[PDB]
Amino acid sequence: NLAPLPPHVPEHLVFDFDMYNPSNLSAGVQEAWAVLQESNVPDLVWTRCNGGHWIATRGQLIREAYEDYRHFSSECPFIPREAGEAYDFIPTSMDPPEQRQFRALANQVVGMPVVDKLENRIQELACSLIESLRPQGQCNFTEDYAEPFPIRIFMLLAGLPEEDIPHLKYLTDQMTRPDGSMTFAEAKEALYDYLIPIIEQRRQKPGTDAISIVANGQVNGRPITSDEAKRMCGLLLVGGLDTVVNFLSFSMEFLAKSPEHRQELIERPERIPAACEELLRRFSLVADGRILTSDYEFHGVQLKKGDQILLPQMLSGLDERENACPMHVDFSRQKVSHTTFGHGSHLCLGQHLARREIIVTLKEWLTRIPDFSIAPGAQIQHKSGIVSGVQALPLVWDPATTKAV
Numbered sequence: 001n002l003a004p005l006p007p008h009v010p011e012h013l014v015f016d017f018d019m020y021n022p023s024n025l026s027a028g029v030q031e032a033w034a035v036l037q038e039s040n041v042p043d044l045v046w047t048r049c050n051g052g053h054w055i056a057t058r059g060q061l062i063r064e065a066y067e068d069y070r071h072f073s074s075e076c077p078f079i080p081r082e083a084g085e086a087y088d089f090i091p092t093s094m095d096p097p098e099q100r101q102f103r104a105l106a107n108q109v110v111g112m113p114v115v116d117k118l119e120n121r122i123q124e125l126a127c128s129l130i131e132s133l134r135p136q137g138q139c140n141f142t143e144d145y146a147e148p149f150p151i152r153i154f155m156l157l158a159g160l161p162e163e164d165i166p167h168l169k170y171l172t173d174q175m176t177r178p179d180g181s182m183t184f185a186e187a188k189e190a191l192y193d194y195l196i197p198i199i200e201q202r203r204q205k206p207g208t209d210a211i212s213i214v215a216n217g218q219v220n221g222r223p224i225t226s227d228e229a230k231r232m233c234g235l236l237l238v239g240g241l242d243t244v245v246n247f248l249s250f251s252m253e254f255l256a257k258s259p260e261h262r263q264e265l266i267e268r269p270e271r272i273p274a275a276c277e278e279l280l281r282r283f284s285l286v287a288d289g290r291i292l293t294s295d296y297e298f299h300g301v302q303l304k305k306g307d308q309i310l311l312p313q314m315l316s317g318l319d320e321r322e323n324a325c326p327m328h329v330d331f332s333r334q335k336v337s338h339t340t341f342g343h344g345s346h347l348c349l350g351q352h353l354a355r356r357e358i359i360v361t362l363k364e365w366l367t368r369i370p371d372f373s374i375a376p377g378a379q380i381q382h383k384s385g386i387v388s389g390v391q392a393l394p395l396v397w398d399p400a401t402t403k404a405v
């Protein structure tokens with residue numbers, strides 16, 4: 001189900017890629033997408049699926065398209081068009097200089113100094129969840145630690161009910177990983193039927209939570225709108241529940257498989273941070289785009305005002321001209337080049353929380369369960385979307401070999 005090639009597209013620039021169902025998914029999602037970088041693929045190519053759109057395939061274009069906010073605007077950053085358009089999260093769907101102010105607020109809530117505040121609850125929870133799991137010698141990493149871990153921290157952050165979890169999550173999921181049960185605009189609505197009443201309540205009688213600062217936030221001398229609030233808190237929900245959740249499963253499936261990687265981390269912990277960056281470069285997962293405010297010629301391709309362009313942040317680090325032996329994990333690379341936290345004026349704000357949640361889990365799980373592996377006969381399945389994932393990750397271990405701490 002492909003749409004007619006638009007006039008301006010040289011059919012030799014065609015390359016039918018389906019972000020919602022890449023071919024080789026069975027072999028893995030980063031591998032699925034890494035096709036785009038074979039020798040036989042143009043640096044910039046046009047795909048006819050999800051209604052036809054450019055996709056830039058190399059480290060350097062993405063970096064370039066990202067810094068160039070002018071012809072490449074965030075206005076509509078989600079393929080397909082309707083969602084992108086129907087998406088209004090702030091600061092996301094906004095170019096600077098507008099953005100600068102909405103962003104500075106979000107940075108208030110999730111930023112650096114919020115992260116030192118939270119560290120202990122993080123570690124406290126990291127230990128507590130692991131130790132619970134320990135003695136069973138089998139979890140469901142995705143439902144068992146992956147889902148739980150990060151969410152409860154955000155629920156802690158935003159002061160919202162755990163009970164809410166399963167609902168917002170489905171909503172978050174449909175948004176990044178469209179099933180077909182509900183369209184983006186419908187998705188965006190129910191997440192909004194939710195937040196709204198909450199934002200009301202924090203306007204009248206404030207709290208210390210992320211949302212409380214957000215409803216009461218200051219933007220360009222004036223007091224933030226209700227809508228701008230609904231809209232900021234919307235982004236936090238999704239970035240909240242959706243990126244960290246998935247990343248942990250790929251990193252963990254990776255460890256379940258490479259006992260020399262567990263070993264290395266375990267004996268030379270001065271390496272968790274480097275290890276941390278290398279894993280983000282490799283188990284990268286986001287893929288949104290931009291929009292052409294006008295006609296423009298990018299690396300000789302005539303870009304026509306209105307066209308969408310995917311700029312997968314996945315691809316930047318999996319690119320040979322950037323990372324020798326891209327698909328191979330090496331905690332001692334000299335230079336880890338990636339753009340998992342995006343790039344440009346829209347650099348990811350929760351990079352600190354995300355990183356901090358990732359080191360905690362590596363340091364803590366290796367401490368208690370140094371040795372685990374994939375459940376005999378289980379086939380892991382990934383999912384591609386605006387943010388990619390793992391269907392479930394059954395693990396198994398020998399209690400006898402763990403350690404409480």
Ligand code: HEM
Pocket residue numbers: 077090091092103106110154235236237239240241243244245247285286288313339340341342343345346347348349350351353354
């Ligand atoms: C697994 C770790 C994470 C990854 C890979 C990730 C990925 C991304 C990427 C690629 C962007 C750039 C958007 C663009 O340029 O279109 C972004 C921005 C953003 N993310 Fe993260 N994210 C992660 C964790 C989080 C967390 C924990 C939060 C906080 C709940 C969060 C909230 C945000 C926000 C608010 C922005 C927008 C900043 C702006 O538009 O100036 N993300 N994220």
Ligand SMILES: C1C2CC3CC1CC(C2)C3
Pocket residue numbers: 089092176238239243286288386387
């Ligand atoms: C908005 C932006 C694109 C996708 C979905 C959501 C969180 C993060 C940044 C990845």
